[PDB]
Amino acid sequence: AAQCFLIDKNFVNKAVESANLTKDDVVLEIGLGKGILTEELAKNAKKVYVIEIDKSLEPYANKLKELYNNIEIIWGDALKVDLNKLDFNKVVANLPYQISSPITFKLIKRGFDLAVLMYQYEFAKRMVAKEGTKDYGRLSVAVQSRADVEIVAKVPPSAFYPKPKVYSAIVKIKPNKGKYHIENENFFDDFLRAIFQHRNKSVRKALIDSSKELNYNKDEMKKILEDFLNTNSEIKNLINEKVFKLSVKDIVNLSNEFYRFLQNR
Known about the structure:
It is classed as transferase. The chain has helices spanning 9-18, 36-44, 58-67, 100-110, 121-128, 138-144, 185-196, 203-209, 218-228, 234-237, 248-264, and strands spanning 5-6, 26-30, 47-52, 71-75, 90-94, 114-120, 147-155, 160-161, 168-175.
């Protein structure tokens, strides 16, 4: 039902400020809403693209485009839109929470200078979570390995109408493709799926239990792992620590070493 439009001008401004916009910036916004945030991006940016599914919101677009010459609407599914065909450097958005996850990685894949995105509070906690904590998981690592992230503000239900049951959060994302060397990104993705499927088990036991994620059966993985651990380096001894207690740096390092081992096995 009319689900949760951003209305509170203070939280709009907080998002716009956090985005540090200048007239040289081209912004992508996900969702038109009432066009309150849209208007603020138009004021401060070179140009703003808005991907919107709901065509009944067109009145807001036409009224807005009568005032600003630098807004362009793309009518469609954000997950379906080819972002490679658009040239932007920032994303600022009150996201539809249902597409929270696949839209984050799609945007990161395409790349941007900076994103200032609204997520439900719980999801943002997991994005920014530190190792050894309740909210630390695959989402944390998947994100922090590719980007620097922080919650710039917590947002109460009173900032929206109809107004949600939960808090939201404004999250700042700064991609840093160079903070970690990754031997093979696809092997990293598989590794992360395998290990966070057994979050409270040792890395060693997680890998054996979810070996199919890395394209090996259980017995192969047992043997591989024993061969891999026959050399005595420190990082390898961290394979007996519990998955959730390894930091992003520890996971990257361990998977880099595992991949290189497998390459000569």
